[PDB]
Structure formats: C-alpha cells, structure tokens
Design an enzyme around this catalytic site. Structure first.
Site, PDB file in Angstrom:
ATOM      1  N   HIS A 177     -19.398 -30.007  17.545  1.00  0.00           N
ATOM      2  CA  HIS A 177     -19.652 -28.613  19.122  1.00  0.00           C
ATOM      3  C   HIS A 177     -19.181 -29.251  19.705  1.00  0.00           C
ATOM      4  CE1 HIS A 177     -22.028 -26.175  15.983  1.00  0.00           C
ATOM      5  NE2 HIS A 177     -22.914 -26.489  16.431  1.00  0.00           N
TER       6      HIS A 177
ATOM      7  N   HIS B  25     -22.406 -34.344  27.453  1.00  0.00           N
ATOM      8  CA  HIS B  25     -21.318 -33.665  26.890  1.00  0.00           C
ATOM      9  C   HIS B  25     -20.233 -33.468  27.776  1.00  0.00           C
ATOM     10  CE1 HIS B  25     -24.041 -30.316  27.159  1.00  0.00           C
ATOM     11  NE2 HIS B  25     -23.213 -30.014  27.255  1.00  0.00           N
TER      12      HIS B  25
ATOM     13  N   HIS C  78     -16.867 -29.667  27.541  1.00  0.00           N
ATOM     14  CA  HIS C  78     -16.408 -28.758  27.216  1.00  0.00           C
ATOM     15  C   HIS C  78     -14.864 -28.363  28.310  1.00  0.00           C
ATOM     16  CE1 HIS C  78     -20.736 -26.613  25.577  1.00  0.00           C
ATOM     17  NE2 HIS C  78     -20.845 -27.391  27.669  1.00  0.00           N
TER      18      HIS C  78
ATOM     19  N   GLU D  10     -15.822 -24.382  31.637  1.00  0.00           N
ATOM     20  CA  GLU D  10     -17.262 -22.299  31.400  1.00  0.00           C
ATOM     21  C   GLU D  10     -17.602 -22.429  32.188  1.00  0.00           C
ATOM     22  OE1 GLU D  10     -20.435 -24.535  28.875  1.00  0.00           O
ATOM     23  OE2 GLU D  10     -19.756 -23.593  27.379  1.00  0.00           O
TER      24      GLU D  10
ATOM     25  N   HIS E 170     -21.788 -32.073  31.488  1.00  0.00           N
ATOM     26  CA  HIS E 170     -22.565 -31.568  31.577  1.00  0.00           C
ATOM     27  C   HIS E 170     -23.333 -32.373  31.242  1.00  0.00           C
ATOM     28  CE1 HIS E 170     -21.514 -26.967  30.471  1.00  0.00           C
ATOM     29  NE2 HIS E 170     -21.664 -27.488  31.323  1.00  0.00           N
TER      30      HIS E 170
ATOM     31  N   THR F 292     -25.867 -23.444  27.165  1.00  0.00           N
ATOM     32  CA  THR F 292     -24.383 -22.299  27.185  1.00  0.00           C
ATOM     33  C   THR F 292     -24.033 -22.176  25.695  1.00  0.00           C
ATOM     34  OG1 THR F 292     -23.158 -23.889  27.582  1.00  0.00           O
ATOM     35  CG2 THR F 292     -23.355 -22.831  29.812  1.00  0.00           C
TER      36      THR F 292
HETATM   37  N1  FBS Z   1     -23.858 -27.385  27.243  1.00  0.00           N
HETATM   38  S1  FBS Z   1     -25.450 -26.857  28.194  1.00  0.00           S
HETATM   39  O1  FBS Z   1     -25.710 -25.924  28.518  1.00  0.00           O
HETATM   40  O2  FBS Z   1     -25.354 -27.926  29.016  1.00  0.00           O
HETATM   41  C1  FBS Z   1     -26.421 -27.467  26.539  1.00  0.00           C
HETATM   42  C2  FBS Z   1     -27.316 -28.509  26.788  1.00  0.00           C
HETATM   43  C3  FBS Z   1     -28.200 -29.266  26.054  1.00  0.00           C
HETATM   44  C4  FBS Z   1     -28.554 -28.789  24.698  1.00  0.00           C
HETATM   45  F1  FBS Z   1     -29.091 -28.474  23.605  1.00  0.00           F
HETATM   46  C5  FBS Z   1     -28.085 -27.126  24.570  1.00  0.00           C
HETATM   47  C6  FBS Z   1     -26.511 -26.872  25.271  1.00  0.00           C
HETATM   48 ZN    ZN Z   2     -23.165 -28.309  28.428  1.00  0.00          ZN
END
Ligand code: FBS
Ligand code: ZN
Ligand code: BGC
Ligand code: BGC
Ligand code: GLC
Ligand code: FBS
Length: 257
Positions: free
Chosen positions: A61, A91, A93, A103, A116, A195
């Site tokens: 992902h 990570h 996006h 996002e 993030h 998200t």
């Molecule tokens: N994309 S995010 O909201 O930062 C996110 C963080 C941790 C997760 F486990 C899943 C999504």
């Molecule tokens: Zn994220």
C-alpha cells in the site's frame, strides 16, 4: 482485500470497514480561512534526536520506515497533545502526476505527496491498545511539493529499488527523520482517523503548513514501486491516497495567529 484501484479503492472500503462513513474520518480539506488560531495550544515539541530507525517495508500500500518504539526515544509532545506520543513508523502517499497525491488538501489544493509520521500515546502501553482509544495516535503530516531536492529524503529514495514489491524489506538503520521536516512548525490540528483501513477514529492530526520541497526525480522513484508481489503482474504504486472526507462536527485549529 482493499487497495486504491477502481475495484477495491476508497469508494469500496465502507463495505468491509463501515466506519469509513463515520463522524471523524480523515483526510479532510483544510479551509485556511475558517481555521481559527487556538491560544490554548501549547508549544509543539518534535524530539527526534535519539530516534532508532530499523527497517523499511513495502506493505503493498506504501512503504513504511519503522522505528524502535520500545523506549521513549523519538517522541512528539505539546501542541494539542496530552502526554507523550512515541514514533513508530513513517510513510508517504503520492500521485501518478505531480498535481495530485496528498490526502489532506489546503483550500482544495492537492500537493504531490504527503508524509505521515505516526506516533502512539504511551499511556496505553502498545500501539494495539492505543488504537482502541479516542486519543491513541498522533500523526504529523507534511506536504511535499516538487522543486528542489530534499537531501534528507535521498537515502529513502535510493533504497526503494531493493523493496520494489509487496512483502520486501531492507535494513534501514541510522536514518534521521529530522531531515524530512520543513523549517517552520506552524500547523493545523483536528481530530480524525487512520486514512487506510481499518480507518479507526483514534488520531489527533497535526498538519504542518509549510511543505517540503522534493525533486521531480525523487518522487519519480516513489512511482516505480509496485503494489503487487514478486512474480505477479506489475501494478505501479501510484495514487495511494484517500480523498478528503466530510468535516462533519469538527473545527480545524491553527497554531499561528
Ligand atoms: N495513513 S495514516 O492515517 O497515517 C495511518 C497510520 C497508521 C496506520 F496503521 C494506518 C494508517
Ligand atoms: Zn498515511
Ligand atoms: O543516525 C540517525 C540518528 O540516530 C539517532 O539515534 C542519533 O541520536 C542522531 O544523532 C542520528 O542523526
Ligand atoms: O462559543 C464560542 C466558541 O465556539 C467554539 O466553536 C469555538 O471553537 C471557540 O473558539 C469559541 O470560543
Ligand atoms: O540510514 C538509512 C540507510 O541509508 C543508506 O542506505 C545507508 O547505506 C544504510 O546503511 C542506512 O541504513
Ligand atoms: N471493502 S474492500 O476491502 O475495499 C474490498 C473491495 C472489493 C473486494 F472484492 C474485497 C474487498
């Protein structure tokens, strides 16, 4: 399972994750004119000097850079936060083109990508318990625009060829996440969610106002990753962003006057 394509993307997630239609989903559009300065916000403290990065993982992902969260090392405190939140992973996006990928949006503007930095509230002992709590997580979000190269991103870029496909990982020790920040810590904050599925409503979002600049070449290398596993048909890992969700009964607060 879930993904970003036409057949398993954000418009389908609610069928397995009904909270997708919940009351504090993320991301949101940040209307900068309606966001209000909040004098009750305390100074924000990003304390990453003792961070211990471990590993980078293509999870199908995105790619995650993972940290040792077994002690208070890299932490986030202050601002809207009550207590101490420990960095577990970061990570990104990103888009197929520079005109999309973030996002959150800012007055409906989409950035090329969004970073993030994910943290969990130490009062709950572990990430898994934290995601059972309304204040379990804090995510520091940083926009990426395309311009000059970000030197502190280059180590990430140059390891991606070794984690091209889902399920691959590589050592990623001695990486300093401080090199991914902009100069200013001015931010917007609101209560929201993960998200990605499971879309849990556990997150205090802190979204920095100042983007970082990355080069076209850096983001082009993100777009060479694969959603699929080794030996499977190649599906480029692009457009791994959820669109903005309804604000509902929320206000976005600003740290700046
Ligand atoms: N994309 S995010 O909201 O930062 C996110 C963080 C941790 C997760 F486990 C899943 C999504
Ligand atoms: Zn994220
Ligand atoms: O190597 C990445 C970072 O690791 C941390 O544990 C150190 O305290 C930093 O000085 C260093 O920049
Ligand atoms: O009742 C007045 C209050 O309304 C709230 O919606 C705002 O967040 C506060 O900043 C304001 O003082
Ligand atoms: O800091 C993250 C990584 O950057 C570079 O890839 C280094 O060669 C590697 O040793 C390090 O783990
Ligand atoms: N709801 S979802 O996880 O996005 C999903 C969509 C389509 C499927 F075939 C299976 C799961």
């Amino acid at each position: 399972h879930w993904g970003y394509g036409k057949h398993n993307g954000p418009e389908h997630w609610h069928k397995d994750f009904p909270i997708a239609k919940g009351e504090r989903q993320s991301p949101v559009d940040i209307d900068t004119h309606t966001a209000k300065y909040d004098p009750s916000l305390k100074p924000l403290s990003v304390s990453y000097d003792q961070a211990t990065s471990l590993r980078i993982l293509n999870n199908g992902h995105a790619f995650n850079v993972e940290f040792d969260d077994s002690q208070d090392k890299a932490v986030l405190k202050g601002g809207p936060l009550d207590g101490t939140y420990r960095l577990i992973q970061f990570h990104f996006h990103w888009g197929s083109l520079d005109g999309q990928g973030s996002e959150h949006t800012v007055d409906k503007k989409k950035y090329a990508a969004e970073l993030h930095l994910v943290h969990w509230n130490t009062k709950y002992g572990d990430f898994g318990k934290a995601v059972q709590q309304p204040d379990g997580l804090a995510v520091l979000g940083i926009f990426l625009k395309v311009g000059s190269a970000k030197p502190g991103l280059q180590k990430v870029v140059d390891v991606l060829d070794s984690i091209k496909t889902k399920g691959k990982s590589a050592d990623f020790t001695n990486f300093d996440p401080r090199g991914l920040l902009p100069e200013s810590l001015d931010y917007w904050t609101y209560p929201g969610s993960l998200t990605t599925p499971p879309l849990l409503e556990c997150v205090t979002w802190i979204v920095l106002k100042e983007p970082i600049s990355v080069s076209s070449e850096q983001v082009l290398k993100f777009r060479k990753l694969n959603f699929n596993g080794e030996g499977e048909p190649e599906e480029l890992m692009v457009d791994n962003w959820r669109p903005a969700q309804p604000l509902k009964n929320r206000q976005i607060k600003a740290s700046f006057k």
